[PDB]
Amino acid sequence: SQIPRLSAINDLHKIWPTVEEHGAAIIESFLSLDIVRRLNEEVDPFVKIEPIPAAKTKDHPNHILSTTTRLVNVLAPISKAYREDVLNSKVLHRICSDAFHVYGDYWVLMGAVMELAPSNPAQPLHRDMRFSHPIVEYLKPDAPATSINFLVALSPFTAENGATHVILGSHKWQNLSNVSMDATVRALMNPGDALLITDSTIHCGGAETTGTETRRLLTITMGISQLTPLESNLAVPRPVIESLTPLAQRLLGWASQRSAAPRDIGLLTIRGNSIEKTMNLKAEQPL
Amino acid sequence: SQIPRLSAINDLHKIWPTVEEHGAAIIESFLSLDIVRRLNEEVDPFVKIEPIPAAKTKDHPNHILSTTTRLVNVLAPISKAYREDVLNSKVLHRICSDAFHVYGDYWVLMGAVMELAPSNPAQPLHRDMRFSHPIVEYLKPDAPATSINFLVALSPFTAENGATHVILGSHKWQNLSNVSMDATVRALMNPGDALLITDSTIHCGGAETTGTETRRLLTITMGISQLTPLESNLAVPRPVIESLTPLAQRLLGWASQRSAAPRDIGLLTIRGNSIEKTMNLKAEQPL
Ligand SMILES: CN1C(=O)c2ccccc2NC(=O)/C1=C/c1ccccc1
Ligand SMILES: CN1C(=O)c2ccccc2NC(=O)/C1=C/c1ccccc1
Ligand SMILES: [Br-]
Ligand SMILES: [Br-]
Ligand SMILES: [Br-]
Numbered sequence: 149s150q151i152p153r154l155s156a157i158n159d160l161h162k163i164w165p166t167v168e169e170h171g172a173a174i175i176e177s178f179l180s181l182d183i184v185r186r187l188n189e190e191v192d193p194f195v196k197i198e199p200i201p202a203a204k205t206k207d208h209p210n211h212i213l214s215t216t217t218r219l220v221n222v223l224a225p226i227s228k229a230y231r232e233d234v235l236n237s238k239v240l241h242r243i244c245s246d247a248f249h250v251y252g253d254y255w256v257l258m259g260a261v262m263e264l265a266p267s268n269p270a271q272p273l274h275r276d277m278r279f280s281h282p283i284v285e286y287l288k289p290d291a292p293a294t295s296i297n298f299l300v301a302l303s304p305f306t307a308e309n310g311a312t313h314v315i316l317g318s319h320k321w322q323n324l325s326n327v328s329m330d331a332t333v334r335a336l337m338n339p340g341d342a343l344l345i346t347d348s349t350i351h352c353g354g355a356e357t358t359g360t361e362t363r364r365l366l367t368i369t370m371g372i373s374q375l376t377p378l379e380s381n382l383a384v385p386r387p388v389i390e391s392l393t394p395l396a397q398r399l400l401g402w403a404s405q406r407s408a409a410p411r412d413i414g415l416l417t418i419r420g421n422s423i424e425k426t427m428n429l430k431a432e433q434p435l
Numbered sequence: 436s437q438i439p440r441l442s443a444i445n446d447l448h449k450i451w452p453t454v455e456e457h458g459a460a461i462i463e464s465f466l467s468l469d470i471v472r473r474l475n476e477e478v479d480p481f482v483k484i485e486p487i488p489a490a491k492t493k494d495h496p497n498h499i500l501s502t503t504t505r506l507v508n509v510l511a512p513i514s515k516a517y518r519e520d521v522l523n524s525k526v527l528h529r530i531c532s533d534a535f536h537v538y539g540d541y542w543v544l545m546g547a548v549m550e551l552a553p554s555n556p557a558q559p560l561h562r563d564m565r566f567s568h569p570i571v572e573y574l575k576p577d578a579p580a581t582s583i584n585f586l587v588a589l590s591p592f593t594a595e596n597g598a599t600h601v602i603l604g605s606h607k608w609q610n611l612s613n614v615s616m617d618a619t620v621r622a623l624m625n626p627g628d629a630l631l632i633t634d635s636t637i638h639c640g641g642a643e644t645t646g647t648e649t650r651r652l653l654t655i656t657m658g659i660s661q662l663t664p665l666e667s668n669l670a671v672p673r674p675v676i677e678s679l680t681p682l683a684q685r686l687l688g689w690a691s692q693r694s695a696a697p698r699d700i701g702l703l704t705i706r707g708n709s710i711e712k713t714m715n716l717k718a719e720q721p722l
């Protein structure tokens with residue numbers, strides 16, 4: 149059976165329950181084609197200048213991504229569409245509050261544009277977070293997902309051009325002896341569609357077989373505010389931060405965070421006061 | 436049997452193994468009396484002006500600490516002794532690298548001075564982190580400690596003035612039906628001595644019974660860089676940050692972090708590069 153397909157607006161309340169059951173769901177029209185176009189246009193040059201993932205120039209090289217792959221993260225200062233439209237997505241926030249209510253506040257662990265070159269091979273079948281957060285491997289098998297990944301198509305996803313593989317139900321697997329490409333189904337998607345998986349869903353980028361098509365995706369890893377993001381917004385100019393909504397500011401770590409603990413004492417606080425109150429951080433100040 | 440006592444220098448290699456076994460150890464002369472004096476002098480006025488933990492002025496009130504208790508965190512900008520001597524402690528870093536090698540890099544989840552007033556009651560027997568990090572309750576019972584707490588005496592700890600209670604072995608308890616003050620032993624300490632416990636050690640602040648003595652402690656919660664600190668250093672002036680060692684900068688979250696994953700892709704990175712490389716962050720620049 150195939151990855152369940154849900155409408156971003158009509159089926160909103162069904163999205164997280166579907167992922168909790170099956171470990172995957174396709175959100176049709178997660179982003180409008182307008183947002184997809186502006187995002188592609190804004191990140192285009194940064195993709196072109198990005199060195200290889202394991203460049204000797206980098207002090208945090210990525211030795212896992214294929215050398216032909218390009219990843220651009222810290223999108224807030226690059227993309228108006230990302231920092232305004234994506235970070236304030238009603239669909240994303242409903243899904244995240246549904247997913248993470250047991251833990252408390254959530255934020256962006258990483259928002260990255262990934263461009264896969266022609267003839268890019270399939271990734272090995274994997275769970276995310278194993279190269280950054282060893283702690284998640286020590287969680288009880290029954291523990292609610294501490295992170296989820298929105299794999300948004302910025303170009304068409306086909307079986308030919310290397311659409312994502314997922315094993316439905318694999319987010320509940322403890323025994324991994326039945327892990328095989330034979331057990332996978334494909335995430336066929338138009339630009340603006342999003343494949344939503346958990347940190348436990350076994351999946352992989354597909355093989356590019358046309359030899360001509362460049363595939364591009366926006367991967368948004370949303371995680372509980374108790375987990376450290378893969379990316380930092382510390383160097384993002386304060387003027388850009390002060391142009392955002394308070395919600396967007398929290399997602400970039402430019403605000404204090406709260407746990408779901410009845411008498412929560414909070415995260416990233418300053419002597420009982422928030423970052424935003426302390427620093428007198430303004431919001432929605434146009435550039 | 437009593438809390439094991441170890442010399443900060445002669446017994447350095449024994450400190451973490453002792454805590455892993457017994458859930459507690461007293462580090463004799465963790466800080467020199469010189470450092471204790473300078474720390475007390477530098478934080479003195481900030482303790483006096485600090486409102487009640489649950490002050491209506493605060494947007495992150497602490498509803499758990501007794502109203503007479505005073506907690507001052509984000510000590511880097513207050514205290515030269517803290518930011519230079521404590522953050523670069525050879526003993527602290529050996530213990531933390533011993534404790535957290537399985538996870539990777541560690542940093543300060545919170546460094547706070549706590550002053551307990553005369554007639555302060557004993558805290559309820561508890562494990563730390565339950566009002567900030569619900570995630571730790573979902574870790575497997577056998578999981579290595581993801582945070583440890585250095586309870587440094589800034590004044591004498593006596594049975595009379597409310598010295599810490601610990602239950603030895605309680606860090607390995609799953610069944611909590613034998614939890615009682617009857618099962619506790621006391622951390623009797625001179626200023627500069629430190630009681631080291633894990634996030635699973637069952638313990639409590641003791642009752643102040645003299646009715647005259649003010650008790651003061653420096654609580655340093657050290658945790659894996661994968662967990663979000665209780666406190667933020669985002670508002671600490673860049674000049675103060677650039678006066679620190681690179682190690683101290685990492686502990687305050689003003690640097691990228693690494694996991695122990697063989698092909699680690701890192702935490703708080705910027706397109707494959709560190710915070711410190713990206714922002715051209717200087718170190719050991721005297722004010
Ligand atoms: C290494 N790696 C990434 O870089 C990555 C990239 C974008 C978003 C999340 C992310 N995290 C991962 O766990 C990851 C998995 C992965 C596994 C196998 C093959 C290629 C990737
Ligand atoms: C609430 N609370 C704190 O505020 C606190 C203070 C300093 C350092 C860590 C810390 N974290 C806690 O878990 C904590 C425990 C706690 C429990 C029972 C009674 C009083 C405290
Ligand atoms: Br790849
Ligand atoms: Br993919
Ligand atoms: Br208290």
Ligand SMILES: [Br-]
Pocket residue numbers: 586598599639640641652
């Ligand atoms: Br105490």
Ligand code: NI
Pocket residue numbers: 274275276351352
């Ligand atoms: Ni993946």
Ligand code: NI
Pocket residue numbers: 561562563638639
């Ligand atoms: Ni405690």
